[PDB]
A paper describes a structure:
Most bacterial and all archaeal cells are encapsulated by a paracrystalline, sheet-like, proteinaceous sheath known as a surface layer (or S-layer). In Gram-negative bacteria such as Caulobacter crescentus or Campylobacter fetus, S-layers are retained on cells by lipopolysaccharide (LPS) or endotoxin molecules present in the outer membrane (OM) (Fagan and Fairweather, 2014, Sára and Sleytr, 2000). The S-layer of C. crescentus is composed of a single, 1026-amino-acid-residue, multi-domain, S-layer protein called RsaA (Smit et al., 1992). In the case of the C. crescentus S-layer, it is remarkable how division of labor between different RsaA domains, where RsaANTD mediates cell anchoring and RsaACTD forms the lattice layer, allows this remarkable polyprotein to perform multiple tasks on the cell surface to form micron-scale, two-dimensional sheaths on membranes with variable curvature.
To obtain a more detailed view of the cellular S-layer, we used recently described subtomogram averaging algorithms (Turoňová et al., 2017) to obtain a 4.8 Å resolution structure of the S-layer lattice directly on the surface of cell stalks. The subtomogram averaging map shows large anisotropy in resolution, with the resolution highest in RsaANTD, close to the 6-fold symmetrization axis. Both the RsaANTD cryo-EM structure as well as the RsaACTD X-ray structure (Bharat et al., 2017) could be docked into the cryo-ET density unambiguously as rigid bodies. All α helices of RsaANTD are resolved in the cryo-ET map, and large side chains are resolved, which fit the density well without any further refinement. There are very few contact sites observed between RsaANTD and RsaACTD, showing why the two domains can oligomerize independently. The two domains are connected by a short linker region, which appears as a smeared density in the cryo-ET map, suggesting some flexibility. The density for the LPS O-antigen is clearly resolved near the RsaANTD domain, and this density ends within the RsaANTD layer and does not extend outward to the RsaACTD. This indicates that upon secretion and assembly into an S-layer, RsaA proteins localize at the very tip of the O-antigen.
Numbering used by the authors: 2 to 1026
The structure:
Amino acid sequence: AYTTAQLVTAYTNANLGKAPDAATTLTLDAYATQTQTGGLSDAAALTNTLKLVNSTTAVAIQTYQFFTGVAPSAAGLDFLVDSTTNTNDLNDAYYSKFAQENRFINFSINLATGAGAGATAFAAAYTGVSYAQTVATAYDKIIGNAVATAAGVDVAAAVAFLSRQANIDYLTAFVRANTPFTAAADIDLAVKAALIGTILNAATVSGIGGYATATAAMINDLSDGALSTDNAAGVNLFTAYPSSGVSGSTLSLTTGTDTLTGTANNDTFVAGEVAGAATLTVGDTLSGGAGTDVLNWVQAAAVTALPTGVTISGIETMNVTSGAAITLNTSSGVTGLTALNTNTSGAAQTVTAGAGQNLTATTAAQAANNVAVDGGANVTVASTGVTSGTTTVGANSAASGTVSVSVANSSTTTTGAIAVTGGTAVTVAQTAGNAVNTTLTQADVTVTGNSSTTAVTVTQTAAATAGATVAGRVNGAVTITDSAAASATTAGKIATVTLGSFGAATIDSSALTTVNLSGTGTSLGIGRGALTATPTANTLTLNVNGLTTTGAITDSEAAADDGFTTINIAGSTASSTIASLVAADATTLNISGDARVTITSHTAAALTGITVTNSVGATLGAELATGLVFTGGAGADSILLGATTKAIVMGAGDDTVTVSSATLGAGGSVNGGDGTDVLVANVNGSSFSADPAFGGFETLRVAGAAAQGSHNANGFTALQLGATAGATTFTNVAVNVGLTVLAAPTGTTTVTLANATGTSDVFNLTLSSSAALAAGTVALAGVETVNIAATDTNTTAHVDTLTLQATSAKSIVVTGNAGLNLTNTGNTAVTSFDASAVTGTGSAVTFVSANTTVGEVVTIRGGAGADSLTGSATANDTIIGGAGADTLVYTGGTDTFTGGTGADIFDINAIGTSTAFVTITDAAVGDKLDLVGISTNGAIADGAFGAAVTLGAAATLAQYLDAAAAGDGSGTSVAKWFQFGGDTYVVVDSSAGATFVSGADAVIKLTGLVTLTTSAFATEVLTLA
Ligand SMILES: [Ca+2]
Ligand SMILES: [Ca+2]
Ligand SMILES: [Ca+2]
Ligand SMILES: [Ca+2]
Ligand SMILES: [Ca+2]
Ligand SMILES: [Ca+2]
Ligand SMILES: [Ca+2]
Ligand SMILES: [Ca+2]
Ligand SMILES: [Ca+2]
Ligand SMILES: [Ca+2]
Ligand SMILES: [Ca+2]
Ligand SMILES: [Ca+2]
Ligand SMILES: [Ca+2]
Ligand SMILES: [Ca+2]
Ligand SMILES: [Ca+2]
Ligand SMILES: [Ca+2]
Ligand SMILES: [Ca+2]
Ligand SMILES: [Ca+2]
Ligand SMILES: [Ca+2]
Ligand SMILES: [Ca+2]
Ligand SMILES: [Ca+2]
Ligand SMILES: [Ca+2]
């Protein structure tokens, strides 16, 4: 049932956006309602709608294909049928008086004989052939000759009609009048164009013929809005929309003896069950003919063997499916067989194919069942739900072509062996799909090549540690062996090996040149064949990509035999890390490519050079030999040097050399090259500026297990600090040079500037870590403004710690996105602490002023964090928290508190006077007033204590105080409150008489009228309600 509003959309898209005339809307509506009532099926109604678009559209698809060899693309069609840009187009003004027929004729003549796209080709193809032949051959290509006769239209009566003399005379006159042709050749040529226009019309109106059937399917595809093929430079109808009406004949086996013979065509043979009794049975003989022949053998019972007297012949594909095990051998009885496919679900397989036959053994829910296959041309094993089951290929007979195993396991019980022997190329692809809190350990793989085996690939799922939401995987050992691995003379064929994760892996091949690594590895041991001949080509290419290793890549051959002299490592698309590289015969080492290669530790004593050419860079964690030359490229290369004897160059990009000894040797130099390069001093003191042996460095970092003592900063533009052996000092530090601390050092870090003597000295300290960093003590004698950045490198919040010793700093400014608890002891010149710019949920800043200048103005600013800001008893502190749960502490003097947004706590730890007291500017609902530290005698109220003290129209502040303290606070301190002159006050009475005594009784001012009626005392803690 189509609604009439669906048929109009189907017509619109067929007409490429032209909406139907009023008349036709009525026609479609009829087709809709005839489907609501079941007087017409669905597909019937939609066909008729698309038949209405014949003249507009079908005229452009069919003619373009016949003349230019391809149907116009959808974008193209838009232009010919319905467009803004072509003023005159098929469904527009110019053509509105041309019938269906004369539309096809028009298009034909345009594309064929003019400057049209087909002129040159059609002119050469149909020159010097007669009218009769023109028509007969064209009728064959369009309408089929066989097809037409079967459809029952008589071909000969039709072709004669089109070529009769009357007909040709009509067109001659037609073409002569209409087209601008006057030459006698061009008229003859245009007449043929008009005829094969006429034939296209006659085809598309009857629905017989190949052109009509294909074009119909393309308009149906164009119906729903989008064209599936839509190639940009045209779609060849016949390719994209296949007919293939012939499908040969379909033959059924019985529980008897069958004698079945195919059509020499696309025929298919069914060998199912009858009452649960097999239909491939004794004496059955099957015969195929031509090459589209299929036998489908399906049985509840286990396949066992071919039954007595059975002969299958001339059949190309055999499909065997069993409810139980399969055991068959097809090296005889079956002849002509190109493809064998065997299918189990939950039982064993034991299959042997003849060479020349492509085997495919698919097994679901393999469990403890074993797959074993042999022989065949290309073999494919596809095993899922695996568990204990061995997979084993070519144990008895190798494949002619490629092996391609793949094995999936969901279990926690471990994936059972996989062994392959032989094949041109081998791939074994394991996966692990176990649950989120389990560990599956994967399958041990063995591949043993025959003398055709050029390549081997062994992929697994990446290892991981079993977590809360991390699926755990351990990797299987892999063992790859070439035929000629044990031979003294025979060549060896395995050239390339690809791994994608692995446990304890081995290769052994004298023909090996390339290893491709990937994912998570334990160890690779490379041996070459025991060839006695001294090898001449000794280049290991080692392409890495996302590789990480527990342990060692070793050249097992190098030790007692002839290893690789040159190793090339090409890092690609992802970072790689090789825990250890052991290559005892290696001479050159070239690290190349695309993404970082890190070698944590190499053992390659005979190395004469290392050469990075890689874009991102290379890092080597092992200290180079004192004799060993190193050359960097662009990108952050990074090494360790000792008392080097050679000229080390680092190339462009931001490089990093760590030195274990302060002066080099022999001679014996290291140039950082272009870019900002770090020099790391793992030593007891340095003076790199002095030594011309070092050049091109910009940053000095003191970090390492031997890093310590006095270091000449001169000539460096930045400073860094890491973990250290002991107290470290930077001397001769230029102006605008900042220190970044990257890890906890040992002992006091002293910075002494080049010239500290001025009174506007600025230093930039940075703290930069992923985790909480205990920066320790840094001393900044003679600096007036100290800027601290506390930087978190990851998304998860932390709080850094620092003792600053800056005895002439007036300003401390804190920026960043992590918290800073700052020890401030003895920093007494500080009058401005500004942590206001700081940023996280909890980048918590702690500060306590060490200022003792009587009557000072000190300004303390918090950040977004839950900050803890304490003033000085000496000082008139202005304290301001930012966002978040700030604690502001009162110590003495005239203080001004502003906890911004959030549940702030105003912690009152001093009594004050009657003049020097704390004013809280913005006390609001949620803020607390901690009076624990003024409970001189006992501990406050504890109730909700909340009726304001009220006095007269002209009572003085002095009077309101005295009134509030009237009671006896000698044994037990009491809270009261009042509102005077537009501000709110709180009192603690700790005294006898009705005098508020300045000394021991306490007042706290709160800007504005804030009603504490309903607000309650926690312990001694008043929460504003
Ligand atoms: Ca349009
Ligand atoms: Ca138009
Ligand atoms: Ca479509
Ligand atoms: Ca039978
Ligand atoms: Ca056949
Ligand atoms: Ca055949
Ligand atoms: Ca060997
Ligand atoms: Ca040897
Ligand atoms: Ca050796
Ligand atoms: Ca470099
Ligand atoms: Ca550089
Ligand atoms: Ca440089
Ligand atoms: Ca220098
Ligand atoms: Ca962090
Ligand atoms: Ca100074
Ligand atoms: Ca200072
Ligand atoms: Ca104070
Ligand atoms: Ca804050
Ligand atoms: Ca706050
Ligand atoms: Ca607040
Ligand atoms: Ca307190
Ligand atoms: Ca009193």
